[PDB]
Structures are given as C-alpha cells and as structure tokens.
Design a binder for this molecule. Structure first.
Ligand SMILES: CC(=O)N[C@@H]1[C@@H](O)[C@@H](O)[C@@H](CO)O[C@H]1O
Ligand SMILES: [Ca+2]
Ligand code: NA
Length: 140
C-alpha cells in the first residue's frame, strides 16, 4: 500500500482558521507542505470536538492513515482522536480511536483494509483546546 495522491482529494473541516500564512485552511493539511497546517478557527475559538474530512477522489480499500502534527509549536497537536470512514460522504462510522502524545512525531494508524470514499479525523482533545494538522495521508 502507498499514499493516495493528495491532489485528487478535497479537504473540508468543521472549523478552520482563515489563511493567515501557513494556517489554517483545511486544504493546508493535504498540500504536501510540512510547514502549512489546518488549524481550527480561533478569535473566537471554536471548541473541540472538531473534525477534518478528506474526500479521497474515489472509493478505495484503505489500510493506513498518517497524521503529521505542526512543527516548532504545539497548539492543536491532537491527543485524543477518532478516525471515521464513509462510503457515501454522509454516513460515517468509527474504525479507530485512541491517544497520541502531544509531541511532533508522525502518528500512524493501521487498520484492516476497509472501503472508503471519505476519511474523517475527529480531534476530541488537543493542545490548547485547538486541533491542527500539517499533513494527512491515506494508504490503499
Ligand atoms: C507559533 C504558534 O504557536 N502559533 C499559534 C497559532 O497556531 C494558534 O494556535 C494561536 C491560537 O490563539 O496561537 C498562536 O501562537
Ligand atoms: Ca501542510
Ligand atoms: Na475529557
């Protein structure tokens, strides 16, 4: 399994900060740039839980998902997550959940191959009460 092409995806999120340079549009989570990040909207803060959804560009049999946090800082580093999948873009179901440390390290989810047109990362808890993500990848 290899990473699906990010340019064939579309990212949307429940909350996103406007483009203020390197943050925080949902689409910055899939631009192949470690220095740009999705960040939940702040001023005013939109409280967790918040989610980011990747429309994959097709119906794929996916087996791995990676979460690269922002670097240089910690706000929004996700520490309690769910990963959900959908086959229709509306009906979602949980396939992964757990805890990550607030460190900058790549966080990797592996799961049984399952069919998906969309993947949704739910940030339940995150540093500062924000959620952010530098790069998200999905493997099929
Ligand atoms: C470098 C850094 O930490 N930037 C953060 C920004 O990403 C956001 O989390 C904001 C929340 O108000 O705080 C800023 O200081
Ligand atoms: Ca990025
Ligand atoms: Na709690």
């Amino acid at each position: 399994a290899s990473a699906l092409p990010q340019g064939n995806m579309k990212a949307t999120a429940t909350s996103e900060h406007p483009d203020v340079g390197n943050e925080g549009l949902a689409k910055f989570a899939i631009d192949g740039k470690e220095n740009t990040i999705w960040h939940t909207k702040y001023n005013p803060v939109e409280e967790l839980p918040q989610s980011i959804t990747l429309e994959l560009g097709g119906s794929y049999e996916i087996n791995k998902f990676t979460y690269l946090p922002r670097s240089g800082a910690k706000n929004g580093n996700i520490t309690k997550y769910e990963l959900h999948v959908s086959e229709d873009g509306n009906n979602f179901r949980k396939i992964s959940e757990g805890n990550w440390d607030d460190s900058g390290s790549l966080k990797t989810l592996k799961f049984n191959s399952t069919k998906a047109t969309h993947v949704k990362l739910v940030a339940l808890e995150g540093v500062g009460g924000f959620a952010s993500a530098a790069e998200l990848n999905v493997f099929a």
